[PDB]
Design a binder for these strands. Structure first.
Lengths: 404, 405, 405, 408
DNA sequence: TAAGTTCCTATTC
DNA sequence: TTTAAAAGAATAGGAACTTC
DNA sequence: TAAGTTCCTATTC
DNA sequence: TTTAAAAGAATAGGAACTT
DNA sequence: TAAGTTCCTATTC
DNA sequence: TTTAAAAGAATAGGAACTT
DNA sequence: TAAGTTCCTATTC
DNA sequence: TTTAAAAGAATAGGAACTT
């Protein structure tokens, strides 16, 4: 992974190699500066500000395809997302003053085709985003409940798994996203060292952790709790920890700490291929449709259909808009916390009262606060000890036994 | 109809037939290239995206009144709505190399202005139209009185009961929802549902997806105190009409038709407009190019402006008012129905709905009806809608109608 | 009044005279086409659309000051509010091609004064927003709006030379305050529209209509019976008797729409300002460029907000609606919002508002509105207004002035 | 202070003193033209509109660090924030004909973004923030165990034994609590008009004390409150200690308007209190955030309340509580009643229903309000708040007086 | 019969 | 106080047929 | 004394 | 999913005094 | 095996 | 009727390898 | 007279 | 912090006249 390489390559060491491809003019030394060219352009236009991993690989792909240098007239050009082609020109010039560079725009979204091309497609389609939303739209409206649709998705990994480790991963990730209404990254980037028990006036306690590197860059919390029924999150967490081990936090920019991350970066690939083939519904058959994002859409729906749509924004970590721009930027130092009655509804021990607005306890023999009171009065999860709070490894352990 | 035939011929046959026309440079084959050309220019400017029926027809006509050519020199021109001409022209020349294509944009001399201004100093179709609309509303009569007169101008002027039925139902339905003809026509029959409203107990709801702006909305029917009762009109309609196969209206030739039936017939609007023109007891209806079936939109819209309730307008009429995955449509607020049902009155001061002293309250009757169970009768009086509209609804309407003397 | 003249001058007759000032190049014939240059420019950029009176005179004043023509090298310069200087150039050219015109922008004449000018002022002010503050403090000083009005109203009684003016000024003021309107909102009223309307509090009321407004959205004007030391009906009575109808002035270069009379004269506002200015019963009227006639509006505005009834303001003041979509307002709205009945109840002083339970509590008094109404229910006192003002009303007003001491 | 003196000299004098400097040019007389120049450049670009104290000072400094001239070639230049340079330069040449004025834009054409100056910096970094270090600490101070109400008690107590006099102890405590309770700035409390105190009723506490502030950073007026609170931290108590130990302050003039419309006679606090307060805070507050150079000091109250609301999922009250612009005889937007129910600590915000729930705790506040409104004729208020007698409505001083004495 | 249809052209959202 | 120009997608009207 | 002030310069809204 | 550049107006820090 | 990985490229937030 | 175009960042896919 | 008018110009919606 | 610039339309003012 070259982006990693770059991060290691020294700046001056870079500005050098770049100038070393023009004194020895060739179609082999220039046609490879792709990555360097990218890194350069960024720092130039952003005044030496770091660049994130994904943002780079995207801009990199673009150059590769728009790269064109003049054989012997000494000209050069490519596509790059900038509104300052001018200055970038003047800057690139003062590097290899013997050439003339040109920055071409990126309209990637829309490209005109050849009539014979357009026609060929049309004829094909004749004899043979939107679609995706419709499919999911219909699924929800067909006998099965979110809770049932999840069960089929969850169980469908049971016997299709080659190893026992993957079965444990996939199965975890899914249930993970659904519960926290999160993305893949929201689950992967979790900092294990942050697991800790928090209280709740319904389930007694719960497991909490933190994610910092998110898409909106607004950190959030991730939870794991006790569910009454044929599915118990704590159980899948348990099975997860035992067959899995810590992961060295990857570097994500040309720049603070955090050495570990709850999951692997490529896990998402095998998870997509899994759902793809082992598809328990037609929606996963659609190309470019939702795969891992499914866990989020699912919990999204579940909450809206209960009227509790407002509760969605919080759980999904939607960027706030009510508070003024500056107030969010320099005065907000604590993130919004998920309300206590949220988990009561997802733990299945309670139900929501759309009218009087209350959490009605569902008649059951297993009381969450009591199974809590007994286990209240270690090294079952090796590899995670010394990293994950003992306080928690202790809680988890005794729960797996006390409750059949 | 042209568009329908066009939706049938395969893309490759469309091109062939087009190139075919210029191999034997003859006026006869070229003059008929308008539909083909229209289809072609779109697919070029939209990289293969489907074309809608209405849009196609509109564009075709613009070409037909503008198609000009010269067989000697081999040049051809015409008008078309677009910015990207060069791309288009070029693209066309490719297909047919020996010809030169010129696209003319379908889109203020000081003297032409001075003349018109002068010709005016000595002596609109819209101005005269608004004038009349203002009057029809300003004068004595209220909206509800105006509705009763229009709705009755059909009672003894129609040829068959079936047409009497549709004309009455379609008008009441456009006024009640502030909807267009298409808003009611494109309704999916299988979508009828019983939804509860805290003022009337229950309300009948149906959905429409294929709408002018492509933004879905609901269509309703409910009880109303007085001589004009929507449910009654719904009743007469259902017994005298049948479902209609959904007409396809996109060249998408997609495997995703989904909607099987539609509520009314596309051609109904033409006969309805004529009846209205020859019988409505208002002068507005005799002004060339003036609102006809679109009258119910003008009526309801105005009603709300007067009642100082313009906050319900965009949502009732479905206009744009400045979590996309699996989108859900904005619902119309319950009070709206309390008002239009005529059972309640809107109180300015408190901004609340006040029931009327009038004896029998609607929430009550709803209960008396929800009670008695097992009324398979619904199925007997609405045979042609059996299996399409939920049994729950036909049984309800059936019960409401029979329980009212 | 030249604008009036223009309106009468024929278009071609104008395009002519304009070209007749360049064949005879002079500093006398060109320096006077100020008005023609204006009329031309407009129709040019607006594609021959009429122009309003006030809009014209504003643009006119601008040219006057920005006029500059080249002595002998052919060309003209002036300021004119347009975003199409280009086309207006090409048009103006094809009139007197022998010249080169130039359109200069207009920046609210915010011309950086000369330092010596700025300094001079500063030094002056040294040895020697504000308006809003004053009015802000007045409301917060013992006296009530009703008291502040009384002092303003009475302050005209003796300061007035004749008796007709005392009647006018005194009417206008109370007028605006009651209808929360501007001057034009009261002036343009069409007398022929007076009519009695009902109210579940005062029994009946007098209503009329204004069409030519600032926002162009017509509105209603009212006059009713007030309990206490001030009774609007009384000032109306006194108004009609000493005043007479006015020929509606023409306000644009149009058409054939009509209205022959307007409730008041155009220059009345002048003598009304000078009156408040000198006879100023408060310091706020002493402020230059401050509110004069607009005071009646600001006053009623405050009165209403202080009663929590701020929402009720928008309606009474005829504020442009924004909730309903642009097109919905433009082509479907044919009836204006009506002032709520419980409004006048509060301004008649017979009732009071109940901020809590939200009700109109009747104030214990011997004189009942509806009863003084019931008796007068079971002519030519206002001559000159008969045949123009509905007899129905002249009859109502008359008998009220008497039955009531 | 320069500004004050400038508000005293007549316009004709300044301009005179100024031009004088260039007629018989001396190095000493020119270098002192900064204040005069500032004033002049503003009055030119604003056609005589008044200049504010802070703005004047800020602009003066930019000129002082940039004034350059050639007495020989009679040329002078400097920096100044404006678009209209030509107009300004020209105007200046008029006043002094034999000189050439050149205005240099105080800007951000951004760092002279030299690719190499950047490569150097990026490199110097690859081998080896104030804004960043500051946020970091703020996040921690809130994330950890302690709650806002516990953090408030500790900061508020860091003044109890280190204050030299009781008067300062009193101000520091009051000022902090007031900035947190209203999510306001120092100026928001300082500029309060003492004569505007009023008793307003709130449906949760019965009554609330309200005062007004007009001269604010964005020039949009707002209210400032004080009320009862269940627990060890009670605003009214702190209000009580302040009033008894301080006195009114003559309104300082802060505009060159030299207007006859001063209106406001007194102000609540002293402009210079912020400096002594900031120091006290820097040496004693029990948190590391307080030791970071250029970090929030008196502005800490704003950060605390703001955050509290975000956490409580009540960001709909933020802009109105802190007085930020929210894209919509003027009247100011009032703060919703529930806000005070929450902060008073007598009620709790219920998420599910979104309603305020009183706490089982015995004595309800609405009740006591009644027991107090009862007994009449307590001229006592006038006795314990002498220095505020005649300035603050008798109604209020009698109320506070009764509240404080009726609490054991 | 002429109200209703059908299939485009002209107009207005 | 109000503000636009142009591709898209309906609704209204013209002729010549159809027919409970 | 060493916290408090006063009157600008540097920084951050 | 988010998006700015620059005139205006505060708050925080530095020295040298005061009380 | 044929389910998992790598490491970019293509699409969708 | 309806109306922003781009920059900044994750989530699917493609194709050759690995176990 | 000095409160009203005329008829544009200057300001404020 | 806060943030649009202009076109389109009435409401005050200025100065010479009129009763």
């Amino acid at each position: 992974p070259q982006f990693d390489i770059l991060c290691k390559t020294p700046p001056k060491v870079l500005v050098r190699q770049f100038v070393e491809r023009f004194e020895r003019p060739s179609g082999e030394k220039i046609a490879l500066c792709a990555a360097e060219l990218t890194y350069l352009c960024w720092m130039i236009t952003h005044n030496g500000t770091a660049i994130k991993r994904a943002t780079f690989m995207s801009y990199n792909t673009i150059i590769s395809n728009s790269l064109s240098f003049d054989i012997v007239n000494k000209s050069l050009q490519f596509k790059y997302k900038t509104q300052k082609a001018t200055i970038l020109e003047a800057s690139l010039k003062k590097l290899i003053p013997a050439w003339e560079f040109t920055i071409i725009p990126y309209y990637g979204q829309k490209h005109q085709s050849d009539i014979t091309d357009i026609v060929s497609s049309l004829q094909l389609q004749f004899e043979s985003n939107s679609h995706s939303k419709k499919m999911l739209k219909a699924l929800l409206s067909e006998g099965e409940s979110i809770w049932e649709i999840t069960e089929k998705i969850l169980n469908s990994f049971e016997y299709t798994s080659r190893f026992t480790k993957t079965k444990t991963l996939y199965q975890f990730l899914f249930l993970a996203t659904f519960i926290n209404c999160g993305r893949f990254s929201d689950i992967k980037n979790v900092d294990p060292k942050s697991f800790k028990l928090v209280q709740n006036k319904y389930l007694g306690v719960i497991i909490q952790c933190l994610v910092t590197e998110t898409k909106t860059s607004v950190s959030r919390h991730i939870y794991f709790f006790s569910a009454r029924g044929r599915i118990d999150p704590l159980v899948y967490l348990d099975e997860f920890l035992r067959n899995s081990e810590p992961v060295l936090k990857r570097v994500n920019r040309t720049g603070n700490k955090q050495e570990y991350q709850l999951l692997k970066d490529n896990l998402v690939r095998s998870y997509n291929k899994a759902l793809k083939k082992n598809a328990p519904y037609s929606i996963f058959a659609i190309k470019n449709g939702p795969k891992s994002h499914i866990g989020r859409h699912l919990m999204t729906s579940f909450l809206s259909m209960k009227g509790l749509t407002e509760l969605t924004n919080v759980v999904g970590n939607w960027s706030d808009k009510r508070a003024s721009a500056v107030a969010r930027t320099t005065y907000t130092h604590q993130i919004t916390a998920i309300p206590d009655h949220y988990f009561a509804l997802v733990s299945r021990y309670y139900a929501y009262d759309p009218i009087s607005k209350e959490m009605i306890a569902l008649k059951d023999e297993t009381n969450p606060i009591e199974e809590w009171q007994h286990i209240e009065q270690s090294i079952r999860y090796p590899a995670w000890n010394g990293i994950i709070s003992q306080e928690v490894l202790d809680y988890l352990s005794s729960y797996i036994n006390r409750r059949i």
